[PDB]
Structure formats: C-alpha cells, structure tokens
Design a protein around this ligand. Structure first.
Ligand SMILES: OC[C@H]1O[C@H](O[C@H]2[C@H](O)[C@@H](O)[C@@H](O[C@H]3[C@H](O)[C@@H](O)[C@@H](O)O[C@@H]3CO)O[C@@H]2CO)[C@H](O)[C@@H](O)[C@@H]1O
Length: 379
C-alpha cells in the first residue's frame, strides 16, 4: 500500500489518481490529509521511526533539511524530466541531486473583491488609502485590507522588495553566514508593515484563517494570498481579480517568494520502488499533470501543461507576480528562519520593540540556530 501525506488542496485529486494507479498497477493508494503547517514537523518525527508516509507533498524549501538528514530519496533521471521547467527542477534540487518531482510553481499576489475595488491600486500608498476608505464606508463590516501579517512568508514581499535578503547569493552558493534580514532594505519593509498597523489598516490579530474566510464570505476587499486559494474563492462565488502587489514606491516593485510544490519520497520507506514508479511514470505524465492543475490550479511545472492554460487570466496575473519574486532558499539552514522572522514580526506589530531591534534579534537567533546545528536531527 502506497501512502501519501498532503494538504487539503490535493487530497481529492490525489485520491482519484490513486484509484487510477491501483487500476493500472494493482497497488492501493491511501492519501491522508495533513495540515500543511504540520507536514514537515510530522515527517521529521515519524519517518525515522518507520511511521512516515511513503510520499509527501509540499514546498521545495524543505528539501535541504530533509536531504541532509537522510529522510528523502534522490530521484534518478527519467524520461519526462526534460518536460519540466528548470526553475522548478532547480527548486527541488540540492547539492547536485533532484529530490522531488515538482507539479507547480506559485507566488502570492494581491487578490481583490470587485464588489469593493474598481481598479488595482497603483502603489502601496494608494492601497492603504483605498483600504481606509473601505473601512470607513462599509462601517467596519468589510475589511479594506487583511493578510497573515506576522507570517514571514506573506510579509516577505515588503521585506525583500526594499532590498532585504535571506542568504547572500555567491559563486559558491548561498552564504548562510551572510544574512540580509536586518539590513537597510529589510528594516524599511518592516516599517511599512508597522505603519499599516499604526494607521489601523492592519491589526496585530490578523491571520491566515481569518483573511481566507473573510474573503470567501465577501467581507474583505483586498488580501495577499496565492493560487492555492483561488478555486475556493471561485467556488464561493466571489468576483475576484488578481494583480501583482502594488509597487512599494513608483518604479520599485514588491518581491514575493516563489514556491515550488512537489512530491518527495521517504528514504526510509519499504515502498520506495513502487513510489518511484508512481512519481516518475505516472504522476509526471502530461495528462496527469493537467488533471492536477484542474483540481489545484497553480502554475504548472510541466511546460507542455502550462501551454494549455497560459491564457487563463489568473495564470497570467500570478506569473507576473512571480516574475518579480525570488525562489525560497532550500538549504538546510532555512529551517530556523521562519520562526525567527515570525517572532520578530509579532514583536514589531505589537509595539514590543523597534523594527531595527526586532530584526537584529531575528538574525542573531537564526545565526545561533545555524551555529548550533538546529537543522541536524539524530537517530
Ligand atoms: O509560514 C512559514 C512557511 O512558509 C512557507 O509555506 C507557505 C507555502 O509554501 C505556501 O504554498 C502556502 O501554503 C499553502 C499550501 O501550499 C496549500 O496547499 C494550503 O494547504 O494552504 C497553505 C497556506 O495555509 O503558504 C505557506 C505559508 O503559510 C514554507 O514553504 C514553509 O516551509 C514555512 O514553514
């Protein structure tokens, strides 16, 4: 029996494809929902005990940490590999080896409810003004702007757009001792975020679940989210539009993270050979990748599938947002970055310290975690 862990977004289609796989190969497939924010942590505790799924579905930033711990299996060259975008294959590659089969690329964008927003704001200043206007006009019941503010993933577009960076790119690879998350640019982005809080357009209690449900109920005019949520908004009957996050200044764009979603094989699994057939000879096929898109419409990682859907206005709008972005690091040292920067944004939006101090603290904590090998797990 082949077991798969994935988020709610992929469960239905992967269970369906699982029954196709069982029909053609005689091997039952059991897909199990795991909340996305728990997949890597669950896998880290489970896989070494022989209790991890055979295949996990998730983000490419996990690759380095999982690979250096011996928990995911290298993917040997296979016929269909030539059909995937280099950016997608590079995202799932670490130290010269491929460590997953990608199905999609993604980035956040401004998603807006056309019942409240008649044109895309031209700059972040215009967005803030428009949000204030909506907050006043509909009496509080409709949020002008809301997003998962304390999550570094979602606030990165601002922090990185102004010049912050996670690790410095060098000819020898990312330099994990050179961290750019408390530099001039980083501070400047985080101040814009604290400003949005100060002017009351965002609140310290803003989070993903509230944003997501408020948008689906027709009571959020503008949010920051990715392609993984658009099906839910469409199914909910929201007349939404999508654009890149408005420039932070005239001529100066936001810089979201780019993510790649993919399938990874548990190196400790007794079913690695059938899992390899599943990923390379079944899932990676043009027909199958297209069915995945229809169920979970992120930017396909197979070029010949993206070709089928390249005119879709969401694909167009998200591609433009991604075009201005940068891939998340996948090195093992990415592991501690999210919690450090999350803690720092929480401190900042709650007025518990200054921007420059909270970020300086964040970088210090990351460096301390890297120095102590937090990304290394044992027995
Ligand atoms: O917050 C830290 C977190 O950042 C990154 O995770 C982001 C994902 O890369 C991104 O895809 C999105 O996750 C969604 C799933 O893809 C989707 O299937 C569904 O389950 O909703 C998710 C959003 O709730 O957003 C997260 C950010 O929350 C990075 O990949 C993680 O390793 C890191 O922990």
């Amino acid at each position: 029996k082949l077991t798969i862990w994935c988020s709610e977004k992929q469960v239905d289609i992967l269970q369906k494809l699982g029954e196709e796989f069982k029909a053609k190969y005689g091997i039952p497939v059991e897909v199990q929902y795991v909340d996305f924010g728990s997949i890597k942590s669950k896998f880290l505790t489970a896989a070494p005990q022989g209790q991890g799924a055979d295949i996990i579905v998730g983000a490419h930033d996990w690759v380095g940490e999982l690979a250096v711990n011996g928990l995911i299996e290298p993917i040997p060259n296979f016929s269909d590999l030539k059909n995937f975008y280099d950016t997608a294959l590079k995202a799932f590659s670490y130290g010269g080896k491929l460590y997953g089969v990608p199905y999609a690329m993604e980035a956040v964008a401004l998603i807006y409810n056309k019942d409240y927003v008649d044109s895309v704001p031209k700059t972040m200043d215009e967005l803030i003004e428009k949000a204030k206007q909506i907050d006043e006009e509909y009496g509080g019941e409709v949020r002008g702007f809301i997003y998962d503010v304390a999550n570094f993933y979602f606030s990165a577009p601002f922090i990185l757009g102004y010049g912050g960076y996670v690790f410095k790119e060098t000819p020898q690879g990312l330099d994990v001792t050179d961290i750019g998350l408390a530099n001039e640019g980083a501070v400047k982005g985080a101040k814009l975020i604290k400003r949005m809080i100060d002017e009351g357009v965002l609140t310290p209690g803003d989070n993903y679940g509230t944003m997501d449900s408020m948008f689906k109920e027709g009571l959020a005019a503008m949010i920051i989210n990715g392609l993984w949520a658009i099906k839910s908004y469409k199914d909910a009957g929201i007349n939404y539009g999508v654009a890149p996050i408005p420039e932070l200044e005239p001529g100066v764009p936001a810089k979201p993270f780019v993510g790649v979603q993919g399938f990874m094989i548990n190196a400790k699994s007794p079913n690695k050979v059938i899992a390899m057939e599943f990923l390379t000879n079944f899932i990676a096929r043009k027909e199958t990748m297209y069915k995945i898109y229809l169920a979970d419409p992120r930017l396909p990682a197979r070029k010949d599938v993206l070709e089928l859907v390249k005119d879709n206005p969401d694909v167009v709008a998200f591609t433009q947002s991604a075009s201005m972005g940068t891939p998340m690091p996948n090195v093992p040292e990415m592991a501690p970055v999210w919690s450090a920067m999350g803690d720092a944004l929480s401190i900042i939006i709650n007025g518990q310290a200054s921007v420059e101090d909270a970020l300086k603290e964040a970088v210090e904590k990351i460096k301390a975690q890297i120095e102590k090998g937090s990304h290394h797990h044992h027995h």
